[PDB]
């Protein structure tokens, strides 16, 4: 019964915080900082390893910039779903966790839209829903065939590999991100383009979900780079950068380089924090430099990990493609710098809520030299 207590404490924590927030709901505290701190404390009871501590760190940094009890509660729900995705041992765990996370995404997207933004945000949420239904239905049908044929539910199969390709957002499965994250709140796009990936990477590494095929990561890299270079809108540029990088990280993870992808996801979270929560041009400039992989900042270390892992596996086509696609993506990042300082006078909203933005920029500048051992 003692082993069950570890999981049960997290429930009891979440429930009592929920009922306390429901009772203590007032206009005097619309920004419920106290429940945010309570949620952060409660999520410490789920840390058991380094990857779980990274999950906690990103979850807390995300919950800081959500406003209200309700959105923070659904971020806690996303954290629970992610924690169970890491611990899933067969098909049922994978399914339960990931469509719980999909439900949390739908709710978070719906509740952060204004009345004037409903026409496009609800359309994007609906399109995401239907595509996710396609993915889940195919997954569970093939899972039924596999469970019939083998008599057991084993998470080392092609079915879960393709389902996790959909979850990662690689090669033919990246369009839901483009449609949904273009029309949703910037924080929602930021937290759901970084945090979900860590659980999928952990599941792939631990449960041996790797394929010999390199087509999908190659397609992700080339398509992401070329579409980023051809995209006029800034949101599409940032969204396609993730497709390219996650294709490259998928190629690295299949070969067993778990440590490097676990560092890359964290450095990418920190790098994307500043450009998505754009309040200052200089912070966004450093963030864009970090995403490009540029040397003075921590983003150079994260990209260097992946590239260094590539030369070890000694696949020439991947390296050649990596160089050319990296140049193509660099052109789009340079477009982003040009738009801020070299096109026209720029005036932005004075949204002085840089909770972890200054800390993230400081970490990007500073952290390069301490982490140099990694590469």
């Amino acid at each position: 019964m003692w082993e069950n207590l570890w999981y049960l404490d997290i429930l009891i924590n979440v429930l009592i915080i929920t009922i306390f927030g429901l009772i203590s709901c007032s206009s005097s505290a619309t920004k419920s900082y106290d429940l945010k701190g309570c949620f952060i404390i409660s999520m410490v009871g789920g840390v058991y390893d380094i990857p779980s501590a990274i999950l906690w760190c990103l979850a807390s940094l995300s919950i800081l910039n959500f406003n209200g009890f309700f959105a923070s509660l659904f971020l806690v729900f996303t954290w629970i779903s992610n924690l169970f995705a890491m611990q899933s041992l067969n098909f049922l765990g994978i399914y339960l966790a990931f469509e719980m996370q999909s439900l949390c995404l739908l709710v978070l997207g719906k509740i952060t839209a204004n009345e004037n933004q409903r026409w496009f945000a609800y359309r994007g949420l609906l399109k995401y829903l239907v595509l996710s239904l396609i993915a889940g239905s195919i997954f569970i049908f093939h899972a039924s065939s596999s469970y019939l044929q083998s008599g057991v539910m084993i998470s080392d199969s092609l079915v879960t590999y393709v389902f996790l390709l959909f979850k990662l957002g690689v090669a033919p499965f990246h369009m839901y991100t483009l449609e949904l994250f273009s029309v949703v709140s910037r924080h929602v796009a930021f937290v759901f383009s970084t945090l979900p990936k860590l659980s999928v990477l952990y599941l792939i590494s631990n449960s041996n979900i790797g394929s010999e095929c390199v087509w999908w990561g190659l397609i992700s890299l080339w398509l992401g780079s070329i579409s980023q270079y051809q995209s006029v809108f800034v949101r599409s540029i940032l969204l396609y950068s993730s497709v390219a990088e996650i294709g490259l990280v998928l190629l690295v993870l299949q070969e067993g380089f778990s440590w490097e992808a676990f560092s890359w996801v964290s450095i990418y979270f920190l790098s994307l924090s500043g450009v998505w929560h754009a309040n200052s041009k200089f912070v966004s400039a450093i963030s864009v430099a970090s995403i490009a992989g540029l040397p003075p900042f921590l983003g150079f270390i994260g990209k260097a990990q992946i590239l260094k892992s590539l030369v070890s596996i000694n696949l020439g086509i991947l390296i050649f493609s990596s160089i050319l696609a990296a140049t193509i993506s660099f052109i789009g990042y340079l477009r982003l710098i040009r738009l801020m300082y070299l096109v026209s006078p720029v005036k932005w909203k004075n949204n002085k809520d840089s909770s972890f933005i200054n800390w993230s920029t400081w970490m990007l500048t500073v952290g390069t030299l301490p982490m140099v051992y990694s590469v």
């Binding site: 098909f91 469509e99 399109k127 829903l129 239905s137 569970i140 039924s144």
Partner: protein, 63 residues
């Protein structure tokens, strides 16, 4: 309909193997599908309430 088809396949496999895994996965499918449909119907109703007068078949995006 498709989710029900998959859940029925899992129940069929459970009967074939005399195992309880498919029964559990099927109740899981029922719950998750119902929750997804409720949220999606919420989004559909909200989408239809925000339609502008000029928009004609808002629900039929596939046209």
């Amino acid at each position: 309909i498709a989710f029900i088809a998959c859940s029925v396949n899992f129940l069929y496999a459970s009967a074939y193997l005399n195992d309880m895994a498919g029964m559990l996965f099927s109740i899981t499918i029922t719950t998750i599908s119902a929750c997804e449909t409720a949220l999606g119907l919420a989004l559909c109703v909200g989408y239809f309430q925000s339609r502008a007068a000029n928009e004609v078949e808002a629900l039929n995006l596939l046209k």
